[PDB]
Curated annotation (Swiss-Prot), chain D:
UniProt source species: Drosophila melanogaster (Fruit fly)
Signal peptide: none
Compartments where found: Nucleus; Cytoplasm; Cytoplasm, Cytoplasmic ribonucleoprotein granule
Assigned protein family: Belongs to the helicase family. Dicer subfamily.
Domain notes: When in complex with loqs isoform PD (loqs-PD), undergoes significant conformational changes during the full ATP-dependent dicing reaction cycle for processing a 50 bp dsRNA with a 3' two-nucleotide overhang and a 5' monophosphate terminus. At the initial dsRNA binding stage, the helicase and DUF283 domains transition from an extended to a closed conformation, this anchors the bound dsRNA through major and minor groove recognition and forms the ATP- and 5'-phosphate binding pockets required for dicing activity.
Name of the gene this protein is made from: Dcr-2
Annotated tissue distribution: In ovary (at protein level).
Residues of the full protein shown: 1379 to 1427 of 1722
Subunit details: Component of the siRNA-directed RISC loading complex (siRLC), composed of at least Dcr-2, r2d2 and Taf11, which processes dsRNAs into duplex siRNAs which they then load onto AGO2 to initiate formation of the RNA-induced silencing complex (siRISC). The Dcr-2-r2d2 complex exists as a heterodimer and heterotetramer, with the latter showing higher siRNA binding activity. Interacts (via N-terminus) with the siRISC loading cofactor r2d2; interaction is essential for formation of the siRLC and consequently, formation of the siRISC. Interacts with Taf11.
Protein's UniProt name: Endoribonuclease Dcr-2
């Protein structure tokens, strides 16, 4: 009885854990990184980590992201828990959310859109480049280009209230 | 009797009411024990305003 | 190009949610191989006089698994927070492969699975119905017991006994006179409730 | 965070945010060219100095 008390939470978490695993395998396959020993059949998913930052919980140090960008020896496997955190929205009152990854993702998206536009339309004034960049990274464009990827059907965005708004398997 | 006020309120209510009210509360509890608030919709008819 | 849709910045859309591919069509079938993944709950809190009961109970080998026709991938360890501390939950990587050769056996399995939510957790709703369509989000939860050796087997006696939770009824003196004397053994490690209170 | 910018650039091709081209693959965005008529690479350095 005591073990079964926790069953709804475990089932709800395994739902989105399987969703995140599917996303992880799909993205690793798209980048041809699925054949790596880390991401192959020998993948050991690391345990989920609590985000304690959440409210309800001389010399320059080299930057890690660039260091693994220029060298493949420091490429780390894309964690399943990280993908679950990306899926889980803040509205779902879970122990992790999507905001911290969203900051880095938004900055990278802005940088990449800027570089792409500057390389594609180097003969434009900065007003139109800024306008086009704002349109590209706008909420509507991201919404549409994620809806056409069948991602929003697997998001975790509602609070878990099993007795009220949940359908058991 | 005790210090737990949450059960003290129920105990004093059940001890300071006529059997009509006590039986009414017991029926209300056994009819809507752990149900969904969206699923229950009931009326209570009494005489005086 | 249009600027009409720039005003409603706080819009939202309705999306048809889809279960993970493993959960879809995961209803175990008669005569087909099925996989059960035991769920292990590991208490992290230190045992004390107030956390003794959970810390001893959750380490018992009488765990429950999840039955699927599909094979689950390796799952990350998950943390859970009870009132008396943090919990670590892991799903066994190697599934338990068993065969179902009887129709009423599967019926009993699904009956127990439905009973758990209907009575033990009280997630049931009047319009809820046991699902046999073998479609989205269809899998069972089965209790496990120790058999021969380290291998585990289904708790057939529990689900053949607990099709529904017995209703709590009080016993008066006259009918308590001839009732058998209570024994310590049938009262050890069980679930009891106060019908008089 | 897991695969660096070179591998992350392919996501924008996957999400169709940035349309790819034969001349300029998406993985070479770090090779940005300050191109166009706005440069004059034949100017000797004394004019700049």
């Amino acid at each position: 009885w005591l073990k079964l008390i926790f069953l709804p939470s475990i089932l709800n978490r395994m739902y989105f854990l399987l969703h995140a695993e599917a996303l992880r395998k799909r993205f690793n396959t798209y980048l041809n990184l699925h054949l790596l020993p880390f991401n192959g059949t020998d993948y050991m998913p690391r345990p989920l980590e609590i985000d304690y930052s959440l409210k309800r919980n001389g010399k320059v140090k080299p930057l890690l992201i660039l260091q693994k960008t220029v060298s493949k020896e420091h490429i780390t496997p894309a964690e399943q828990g990280e993908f679950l955190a990306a899926i889980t929205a803040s509205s779902a009152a879970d122990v992790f959310d999507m905001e911290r990854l969203e900051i880095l993702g938004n900055s990278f998206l802005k940088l990449s859109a800027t570089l792409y536009l500057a390389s594609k339309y180097s003969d434009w004034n900065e007003g139109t480049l800024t306008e086009v960049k704002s349109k590209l990274v706008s909420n509507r464009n991201l919404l549409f280009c994620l809806i056409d990827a069948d991602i929003p059907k697997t998001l975790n965005t509602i609070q878990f209230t099993p007795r009220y708004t949940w359908l058991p398997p | 009797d005790d210090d737990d006020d949450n059960v003290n309120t129920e105990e004093v209510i059940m001890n300071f009411s006529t059997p009509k009210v006590q039986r009414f509360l017991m029926s209300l509890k056994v009819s809507f024990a752990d149900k969904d608030p969206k699923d229950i919709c009931c009326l209570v008819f009494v005489e005086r305003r | 190009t249009a600027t009409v849709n720039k005003a409603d910045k706080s819009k939202d859309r309705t999306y048809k949610t889809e279960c993970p591919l493993e959960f879809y069509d995961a209803l175990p079938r008669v005569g087909e191989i099925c996989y059960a993944y035991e769920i292990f709950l590991e208490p992290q809190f230190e045992s004390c006089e107030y956390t003794e009961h959970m810390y001893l109970n959750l380490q018992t080998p009488r765990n429950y698994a999840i039955l699927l026709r599909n094979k689950l991938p390796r799952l990350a360890e998950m943390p859970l927070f009870s009132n008396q501390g943090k919990l670590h939950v892991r799903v066994a990587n190697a599934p338990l492969e068993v065969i179902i050769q009887n129709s009423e056996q599967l019926e009993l399995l699904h009956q127990f699975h439905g009973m758990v939510f209907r009575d033990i957790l009280k997630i049931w709703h009047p319009f809820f119905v046991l699902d046999r369509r073998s479609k989205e989000n269809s899998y069972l939860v089965v209790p496990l017991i120790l058999g021969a050796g380290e291998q585990k087997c289904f708790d057939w006696e529990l689900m053949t006994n607990f099709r529904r939770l017995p209703q709590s009824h009080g016993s008066n003196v006259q009918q308590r006179e001839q009732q058998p004397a209570p024994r310590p053994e049938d009262f050890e490690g069980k679930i009891v409730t106060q019908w008089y209170a | 965070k897991n695969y660096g910018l070179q591998h992350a650039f392919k996501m924008l091709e996957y999400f169709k945010i940035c349309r790819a081209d034969i001349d300029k693959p998406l993985t070479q965005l770090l090779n940005l060219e300050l191109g166009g008529k706005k440069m004059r690479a034949n100017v000797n350095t004394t004019e700049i100095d």
